[PDB]
Write a protein that binds this DNA or RNA. Structure first.
Lengths: 123, 80, 150, 205, 129, 80
RNA sequence: ACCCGCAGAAGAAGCACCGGCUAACUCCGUGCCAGCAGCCGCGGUAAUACGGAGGGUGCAAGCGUUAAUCGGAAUUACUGGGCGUAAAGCGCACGCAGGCGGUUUGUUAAGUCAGAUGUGAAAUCCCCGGGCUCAACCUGGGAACUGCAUCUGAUACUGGC
RNA sequence: UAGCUAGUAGGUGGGGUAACGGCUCACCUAGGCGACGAUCCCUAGCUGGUCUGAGAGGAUGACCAGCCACACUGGAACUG
């Protein structure tokens, strides 16, 4: 490449583009929720996984994961969505938080006090 | 027209009591022409806690610069 | 206080015929602790034997360095099969620092005050031979000036 | 990091005397002393060629009761002072205010000698002090405020100072509660169960 | 032509160390015999001479000294082409000051050491280290 | 002293003016561009003796219109 | 502010984690079910990876978890550029605009440079002092910024002829 | 996005202005811009300074100063 081929434009830089574009750079996004479904995970492993359908307050509608066990997740309950790639589900990149809005905490919890939507009772 | 003022010249409650040559148009914490010394009564327990430049002062007092009540007792002491 | 140092260990597993076999390779250094460096390759069906073969070669290998006062005077490069190890004299702090396969090599040469990176292949049996090509490449000043007549 | 638990349990984990929970009733008998920690463990772990120095370094750090950034401060100070870095690192920790308050006998433990500094009970050059990061000057006086002289804390610490090996580099009195840091210890003055001169090959980074 | 006689000088010596040859021959020019005296002055060559008038030819006697090789890189700076000038106070240094930059100055072709000691600036043509 | 510029005539189709193409160099040492450029400038001329191809020398003078302030001093080189 | 008293241990400790990388792990339940992950993969009757118990590791008024931009990546290359087949050489070519060429002298002194004179204020990096406990911050004294502009010279060289 | 321009280019002389100029008028001329990116769209206040790294190189113009532009949202003026 001659100096005559490097004229009027600096060398290009690229990629690092969102794999979670429906969040529009926000770390946690608000959405209404309409239905929950059970589906087949990756690998011959006989396990099952849960997913929900969530329209966001910016007009995108995503397929989101449900972690842990048990739910109160229903039509127009309103919940918060984040990123978080799943190795056990094809195309699943969106995840639900229990620590916000109508979403329920996990029952019988003795581990990790800040996770899965739990808060220890106080006076 | 030229004048001389005393300023706190420092951070929150940590003044240095600096004296500057400036113009009558300037603001309380605004512009100034020359920094000429400091007139601090505490000076963090310093023995040379007050000072004035004896060449820069003669360029403006001798010469029409007005001096505030806040530093005149020092300019009188070096007799400039 | 001569010290015999290990760089890395590798395991190579091969299907035969029916079933599998596996051997281990080690890379060690001994040198002299000042102005001389030396390294050995060793391969066996067990790690302690691969290290034992490597030490038996490392004590029978030597390279002389143009070294004075335990330190470098100029930046230097050395190359081997995609490892492009570049060395700079390091001062006013910690002496090691540098790439993980270089730290014992500099110390058995007595020059463990140097910042070095691989700038290519990170494979330790290429990296050590590119670091040693740099210790072979460096010269004294003294000799880079003494090339003048008289 | 805060341990939030028994001082003897911590001292057994580190396998050595830290000058913690000290008192004239002494160590030896009914206190698990010199026993290995937990259900299984060695009285000297076998360790890597860096780990053997790193484990001695964290004993030097805890036996003088300093933070990692403060241990590194004296390492960087000794790395620009004369020969062996480790003997000079120890001569900087041994000359620090909180350990001098311990060697003078005003606290029963190094942790209590340091508590007396944070609690503003100590004086140096006749002047009140609060920061444990201070290097004591040769032939200067260390004392305590008269408002603190009737604490059993100091009576029982000076009672213990009468029941240990005499520090050969200073002088102090329990009726005045006042002592002079004449010099640092030199060569045959000082020893410990842990090593200093071999850990001169650390950091990383 | 031969549209750059300086690349004819530079390659013929760089390729000569790569063949471990005792001397090399090239067509002569006034820059080639100036650069040859700087290379003889810093000890990168042993001697140089010219022979003939109809086709004057330059013979360079090579020097390799103790150990292996006498130079790592011999690099172009000014070109026939884009020419790079510096003042006496703006002269670069090569290889922690153990390498040379070649400068044509106002006086003649010399080292950056000789130039900053003579208080001169000019066109920088080569780096040798 | 005055700044002087030189360039070639590219139009003469004005009652008291000419249009000149002037040559300059650019280093731009924050990108390293190292190029020649040609600027088209409008120039005042009440002698009207320049042909389209002649080379002219110009000076800073007086504003007349957009990009026109410079005036003709002399013809340097006549075409051909 | 700063100093001296008075109550009474009183008013004051969490969060992530324990196969291996990378520091801590044993026994028991579940028995491919159900969960767990940064990547390996774990899980069918001794599960170092799930759940629980008893202990243990890292950090601490915090501890985990995330977002955007730049690094590690020479992986947009000046320093580190590349192009048979991996990846990048126009089907075979002509040629206008752009880029661009040996050697010598005379001439000009634009650029080039040596001496001379300006600028790039204050703060501050860095360097020699002072103040607070470090990191901050404040304060006394410094240093430099290829150039651009002007002037006295030289024309080795580049441009011009 | 490769074409775009009648107040668009040039002459002469008033009227207004500190003052230049289709600012605006009278009577003429037929020119101008274009791959060194014209025409058009999107982003953005500028500088001292600030940020990042092996530097090189990019990025940045919250902070404290020196300027600009602007003040319901648009268009004009006076007074000093």
């Amino acid at each position: 490449a001659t100096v005559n081929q490097l004229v009027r434009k600096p060398r290009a830089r690229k990629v690092a583009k969102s794999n979670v574009p429906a969040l529009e750079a926000c770390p946690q996004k608000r959405g209404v929720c309409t239905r929950v479904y059970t589906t087949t995970p990756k690998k011959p492993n006989s396990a099952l996984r849960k997913v929900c359908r969530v329209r966001l307050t910016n007009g995108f509608e995503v397929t989101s994961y449900i972690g842990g066990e048990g739910h109160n997740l229903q039509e127009h309950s309103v919940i918060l969505i984040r990123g978080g790639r799943v190795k056990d589900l094809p195309g699943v990149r969106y995840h639900t938080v229990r620590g916000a809005l109508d979403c329920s905490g996990v029952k019988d919890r003795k581990q990790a006090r800040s996770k899965y939507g739990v808060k220890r009772p106080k006076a | 027209m030229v004048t001389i003022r005393l300023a706190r010249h420092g951070a929150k409650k940590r003044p240095f009591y600096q004296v500057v040559v400036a113009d009558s148009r300037n603001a309380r914490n605004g512009r100034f022409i020359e920094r000429v010394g400091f007139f601090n009564p505490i000076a963090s327990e310093k023995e040379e806690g007050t000072r004035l430049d004896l060449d820069r002062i003669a360029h403006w007092v001798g010469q029409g610069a007005t001096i505030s009540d806040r530093v005149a007792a020092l300019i009188k002491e070096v007799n400039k | 206080e001569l010290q015999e140092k290990l760089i890395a260990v590798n395991r190579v597993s091969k299907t035969v015929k029916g079933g599998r076999i596996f051997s281990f390779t080690a890379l060690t250094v001994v040198g002299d602790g000042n102005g001389r460096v030396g390294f050995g390759y060793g391969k066996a069906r067990e790690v302690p034997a691969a290290i034992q073969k490597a030490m038996e070669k490392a004590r029978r290998n030597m390279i002389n360095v143009a070294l004075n006062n335990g330190t470098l005077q100029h930046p230097v490069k050395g190359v081997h099969t995609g490892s492009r190890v570049f060395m700079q004299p390091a001062s006013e702090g910690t002496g090691i620092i540098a790439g993980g396969a270089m730290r014992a090599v500099l110390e058995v040469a007595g020059v463990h005050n140097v910042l070095a990176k691989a700038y290519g292949s990170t494979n330790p049996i290429n990296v050590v031979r590119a670091t040693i090509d740099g210790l072979e490449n460096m010269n004294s000043p003294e000799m880079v000036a003494a090339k003048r007549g008289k | 990091a805060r341990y939030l638990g028994p001082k003897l349990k911590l001292s057994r984990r580190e396998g050595t005397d830290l000058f913690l929970k000290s008192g004239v009733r002494a160590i030896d008998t009914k206190c698990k002393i010199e026993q290995a920690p937990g259900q299984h463990g060695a009285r000297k772990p076998r360790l890597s060629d860096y780990g053997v120095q790193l484990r001695e370094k964290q004993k030097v750090r805890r036996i003088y009761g300093v933070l990692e950034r403060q241990f590194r401060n004296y390492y960087k100070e000794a790395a620009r002072l004369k020969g062996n870095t480790g003997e000079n690192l120890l001569a900087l920790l041994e000359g620090r205010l909180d350990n001098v308050v311990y060697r003078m006998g005003f606290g029963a433990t190094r942790a209590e000698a340091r508590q007396l500094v944070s609690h503003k009970a100590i004086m140096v050059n006749g002047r009140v002090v609060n920061i444990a990061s201070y290097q004591v000057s040769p032939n200067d006086v260390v004392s305590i405020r008269e408002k603190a002289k009737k604490q059993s804390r100091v009576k029982a610490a000076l009672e213990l100072a009468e029941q240990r090996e005499k520090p050969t580099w200073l002088e102090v009195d329990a009726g005045k509660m006042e002592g002079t840091f004449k010099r640092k210890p030199e060569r045959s003055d000082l020893s410990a169960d842990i090593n200093e001169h071999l850990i001169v090959e650390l950091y990383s980074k | 032509s031969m549209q750059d006689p300086i690349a004819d000088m530079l390659t013929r010596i760089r390729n000569g160390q790569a063949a471990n040859k005792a001397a090399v021959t090239m067509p002569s020019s006034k820059l080639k015999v100036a650069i040859a005296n700087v290379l003889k002055e810093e000890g990168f060559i042993e001697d140089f001479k010219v022979e003939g008038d109809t086709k004057p030819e330059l013979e360079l006697t090579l020097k390799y000294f103790q150990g292996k090789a006498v130079v790592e890189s011999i690099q172009r700076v000014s070109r026939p082409g884009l020419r790079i000038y510096k003042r006496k106070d703006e002269l670069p240094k090569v290889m922690a000051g153990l390498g040379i930059a070649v400068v044509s100055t106002s006086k003649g072709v010399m080292t950056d050491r000789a130039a900053r000691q003579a208080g001169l600036g000019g066109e920088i043509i080569c780096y040798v280290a | 002293k005055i700044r002087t510029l030189q360039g070639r005539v590219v139009s003469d189709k004005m009652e008291k003016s000419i249009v000149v193409a002037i040559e300059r160099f650019v280093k731009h040492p924050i990108y390293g561009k190292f190029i020649k450029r040609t600027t088209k400038l409008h120039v005042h001329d009440e002698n009207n003796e320049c042909g389209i191809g002649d080379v002219v020398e110009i000076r800073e003078c007086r504003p007349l219109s957009k990009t026109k302030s410079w005036t003709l001093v002399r013809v340097v080189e006549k075409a051909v």
